């Protein structure tokens with residue numbers, strides 16, 4: 001049967017959902033709630049058959065949908081999960097971060113415990129082809145992952161609808177908003193929960209000259225995070241939002257006693273100027289310990305997927321797995337509520353550590 | 364001044380003739396590099412191990428051997444001294460030299476191992492009438508030198524400095540001395556003093572805080588020395604905060620033998636990024652794999668996005684003389700000029716050596732306790 005989606009919030013990333021759903025056989029967007037006119041026009045040009053609703057209540061009351069995507073601003077997510085839970089529980093793909101406000105953790109945990117349908121948190125990085133390749137090969141190459149290092153070097157946060165992503169109260173803070181992906185990757189690779197975070201971070205460069213109602217953006221733009229895991233593995237994140245010139249936006253290194261594996265992940269092709277030549281191809285580098293003979297493999301993305309989004313086709317691959325769960329051919333929520341909450345708790349811990357200059361314990 | 368006692372805390376609340384003392388692997392590197400200097404020679408060696416005395420004699424056949432520090436100082440015709448003894452020996456030997464025959468000294472890293480020696484060694488250095496140069500040579504490796512010269516201009520000001528060392532396990536040493544923290548000072552002191560010093564040099568500021576995670580995860584766990592298992596760390600991460608707000612990160616892995624580049628160093632600021640790619644010793648590159656990796660620097664300007672890569676090759680003659688990309692030779696050129704009086708600058712001071720050791724001790728304490736460690740100076 002066809003899978004019919006409803007979308008709550010349809011700006012840049014909700015438009016990337018619309019384009020990638022459109023590439024799936026047997027899926028369609030039937031319903032959209034998007035309160036911004038310009039975005040309503042942009043969504044209506046992408047998905048002309050989709051009906052618009054004036055509210056979440058109106059969409060849930062009348063739409064014929066099998067599942068929902070939340071792509072509203074970060075601070076909206078927890079209230080919209082609670083509203084859907086009280087109104088019409090459906091399989092839900094909630095954009096990261098799962099939530100922004102620590103005060104919401106108890107009530108959302110209780111909501112998720114009682115929610116009779118899947119909750120999938122849309123941390124799609126594991127499906128970027130170079131990252132997926134590293135995940136599939138890391139155990140065999142490393143002989144067990146002792147250390148995992150992740151580096152994000154990119155350009156400053158884009159301008160958003162109502163400028164929402166310029167303030168911590170709206171985003172959850174930069175380690176929550178941008179780095180939840182990397183924290184979740186640490187748990188996926190190491191297959192253990194974190195026990196401690198140590199961080200250093202600041203707002204060194206970005207948005208310091210910007211004013212909104214007389215207020216200065218307060219979001220971090222760089223830092224380092226060390227994460228200790230139950231039983232002894234360790235990981236490190238490096239973030240810089242003013243490193244626009246880096247050839248690869250993400251690099252991920254996994255090391256163990258038999259070898260090392262590294263992924264090189266390009267940024268969005270739309271931000272690679274044509275005057276710079278062809279964008280970088282994604283790579284994986286395998287460096288076995290005993291031979292010292294390195295292997296480099298190109299892991300290109302299907303051009304149709306590069307056309308549909310900014311995340312190396314990962315949004316499409318995420319939807320294929322989500323649709324399989326909605327259809328019932330799969331039982332698996334690959335990125336659960338609990339994975340989303342761990343990744344948020346790790347970013348909150350990093351922000352608290354960076355603010356206090358002290359280690360932060362997690363339980 | 365710093366105050367830390369009970370509940371009181373100021374921070375952290377919410378011809379030139381050379382004598383050689385020690386002539387194993389690194390003292391033999393000093394012999395080969397001194398021999399490349401015009402108007403320098405090794406006149407005197409104290410090396411207590413017969414097999415190393417034979418190896419040292421084959422390299423520097425005109426050098427005279429002495430049975431102790433006291434014997435060398437009593438009768439050797441020398442203008443300066445190199446200390447390349449095991450780490451735990453350095454403090455006692457500096458004190459001995461200061462009491463007997465102070466001369467210009469090139470003291471191998473780490474400057475010391477035991478925090479109980481800091482006060483007495485600082486007293487010795489304050490009263491010492493000749494230069495003390497701590498032999499942290501990495502700044503002279505051609506790719507690192509290029510990064511140090513260009514980083515301010517490329518970055519528009521260094522906000523972040525990331526250093527990574529991926530290499531093979533600690534080599535076997537005379538009497539197995541480098542297998543035990545009491546002998547080495549711990550791995551962040553023995554191996555990573557170089558990187559902590561490069562952070563102070565690049566950022567031109569002192570550290571205020573260290574956060575670290577480290578362990579002995581893999582290496583030497585199956586070795587036994589008359590019942591003792593080695594206790595040295597083999598991997599970790601260190602975050603260092605600086606006066607003025609710059610931050611740095613060190614990543615160490617002593618079981619990443621396969622990494623093409625043994626050291627990589629990245630500096631990032633609002634105008635761009637610079638990265639150095641530093642090969643390990645050519646003698647450990649398998650000849651079946653072809654030519655060893657060429658040192659490189661990569662310039663990534665923020666607004667242009669026009670990336671440039673430069674090859675920075677080391678003179679073959681210097682690669683034949685040592686394991687450190689010719690840096691031992693460059694160090695010796697500068698030290699020799701200071702001994703001759705053509706220069707007055709000690710580029711790597713006692714204080715620089717002590718800072719790098721204190722940063723490694725803080726990292727080890729932070730990793731052992733799971734807590735941030737404050738530093739004052």
Ligand SMILES: NC(=O)c1ccc[n+]([C@@H]2O[C@H](COP(=O)([O-])OP(=O)(O)OC[C@H]3O[C@@H](n4cnc5c(N)ncnc54)[C@H](O)[C@@H]3O)[C@@H](O)[C@H]2O)c1
Pocket residue numbers: 008009010011012013014033034035036039071072073074076095096097122123124160161162164177311
């Ligand atoms: N997974 C990823 O890689 C990725 C990438 C970018 C953004 N995101 C996430 O997507 C979400 C949206 O980010 P974006 O870049 O699309 O921002 P955006 O500003 O481009 O789009 C947000 C949209 O939400 C609408 N909106 C505002 N309040 C709403 C409400 N109460 N209910 C419904 N819609 C509402 C706005 O009108 C706007 O069109 C955020 O949670 C963000 O973190 C995820």
Ligand SMILES: NC(=O)c1ccc[n+]([C@@H]2O[C@H](COP(=O)([O-])OP(=O)(O)OC[C@H]3O[C@@H](n4cnc5c(N)ncnc54)[C@H](O)[C@@H]3O)[C@@H](O)[C@H]2O)c1
Pocket residue numbers: 384385386387388389390409410411412415447448449450452471472473498499500536537538540553687
């Ligand atoms: N890049 C560098 O700067 C670099 C690299 C390697 C080693 N080092 C330093 O060089 C020193 C020696 O390391 P190595 O690799 O040559 O070790 P090694 O074991 O190869 O050589 C040390 C030598 O010291 C001799 N020795 C022991 N006790 C002594 C004493 N009391 N007085 C004099 N000599 C004594 C031993 O017999 C041995 O030959 C250490 O401080 C080490 O950290 C520095």
